Amino acid sequence: MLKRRNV
Amino acid sequence: ENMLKRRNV
Amino acid sequence: GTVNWSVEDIVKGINSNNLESQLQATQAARKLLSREKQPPIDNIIRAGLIPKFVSFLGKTDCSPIQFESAWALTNIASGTSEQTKAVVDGGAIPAFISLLASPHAHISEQAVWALGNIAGDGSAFRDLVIKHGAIDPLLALLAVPDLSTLACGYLRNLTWTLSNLCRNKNPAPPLDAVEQILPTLVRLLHHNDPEVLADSCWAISYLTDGPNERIEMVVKKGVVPQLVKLLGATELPIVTPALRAIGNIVTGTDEQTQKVIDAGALAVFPSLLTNPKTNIQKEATWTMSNITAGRQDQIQQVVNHGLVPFLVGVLSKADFKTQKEAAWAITNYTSGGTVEQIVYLVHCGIIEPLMNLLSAKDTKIIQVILDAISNIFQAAEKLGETEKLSIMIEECGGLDKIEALQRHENESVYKASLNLIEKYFS
């Protein structure tokens, strides 16, 4: 998942 | 972010 | 007559068998707690006053003492977890919930404020408030044809409290609690008060900060358009949380991401990516990285809005943190973009600023960049342009930094470096 939740 | 608690002054 | 009292005097009166004396004493307590600095919260707590205050909440016949004690408890709960716990331990929750139905708006307002501070403490109390059934009484307070008929400050208090019931993550609010609240939330998100607007966004930003199922129940209400709109707001207090919601929503499925794009989100980014408030710029770039990390037709959307140039800019000069978000945006783009697209990127001038970043004191970004370069070469490998690309990277002294990294300590690094060197240069 390239989508990173750096939150 | 608007913080957790608020004091009525 | 109720100004500057001593804790013991407040005790002396609250303990007398005189309702009026208690009222006076309770009000004196309120003033101590409502004082500019260092409200004697621990002193009042030690005196064992909370149980007394809590019990005054139920004195229907004396709304005045109800209010005062409410205000007092409110400020105690406004403190530390330690302190807030004291209020909860006193049985304040059920009692405050009971005051939401009060005929005296300023009293149920206090109750709102109080419950606001309690759920604020965190997951645990947040959920205890819900378990005592606060949500209905609260929402009932907004069941009006037009939100504008409500007292401005009163409406803000409710919004703020509602936002707190959406806050915190371990665990996240109960699904049915979120489902229940969302409708009012959507409606508040269309109100004209900047305050209400800001906290409404925060509430949404909280609900969208979690698993895709969570994001979905929000997106499912069709608020994205309104968010994109608020994203364009002129008041930073609104823009910040709005950008947070949008940024979170784009961490979900591509279909969810598509929603913000379809909403026009991108058109605002030239502004956001050059916004003066550093933090807005970081959030914006972070969001961009979660868009470049999607479908190609989506990457293309970025390209059509002329956002690449801005990414180059951000990568070139900005707070390091924003640059780190840029590095990712770029690497993600090169990670899933077409050849024609990875080319356009190089044509915009991505190579130089990207190389200069290799000098950064951060092993992690250094990886994201080398990683990104890799992706680019491979696109240039498919066009037999590998050499030409080498020159560029060599022209701006990039190679001079890759062979240095080659002698870096971190494994991931020196390894990625070497490969590039031998395979594309020496």
Domain limits, chain C: 1-426
DSSP code string of A1-7 = -------
As a CATH number, domain C1-426 is 1.25.10.10
Question: In this complex, which chains have at least 3 CB pairs below 8 Å with chain A?
Answer: C
Angle subtended by helix axes C278-292 and C296-304, to nearest 10:
140
The answer to whether the bond into C171 is cis (omega within 30° of 0) is yes
Q: How far does the CA of residue A3 sit from the closest CA of chain C (Å)? A: 5
> Residue for token digits 């062979």?
C403
Q: How far does the CA of residue C331 sit from the closest CA of chain A (Å)? A: 10
**C405 close to C417: Cβ distance less than 8 angstroms:** yes
Virtual torsion, Cα C237, C241, C243, C244, nearest 10 deg = 150
**C307 close to C287: Cβ distance less than 8 angstroms:** no
Virtual torsion, Cα C261, C218, C109, C18, nearest 10 deg = -140
CB contact under 8 A, C113 and B8: yes
CB contact under 8 A, B2 and C198: yes
Instruction: Name the residue type at position C240.
Output: T
Of the candidates C209, C252, C332, the beta carbon closest to that of A2 is on C332
> Residue for token digits 């969208």?
C208
d(CA C53, CA C215): 41
What does residue C318 show for φ and ψ, rounded to 5 degrees? 175, 175
**C309 close to C298: Cβ distance less than 8 angstroms:** no
d(CA C417, CA C426): 12
Task: Please state how this structure was obtained.
Answer: X-ray
CA angle C215, C221, C225 (to 5 degrees): 90
d(CA C149, CA C321): 44
Among C113, C156, C236, the residue to mutate for chain B (most B Cβ within 10 A) = C113
Helix (H, G, I), strand (E, B) or coil at C101: coil
| Burial track C108-147 (b if 16+ CB lie within 10 A, e otherwise) | bbbbbbbbbbbbbbbeebbbebbebebbebbbebeeeeeb
Among C251, C254, C256, C368, the residue to mutate for chain A (most A Cβ within 10 A) = C251
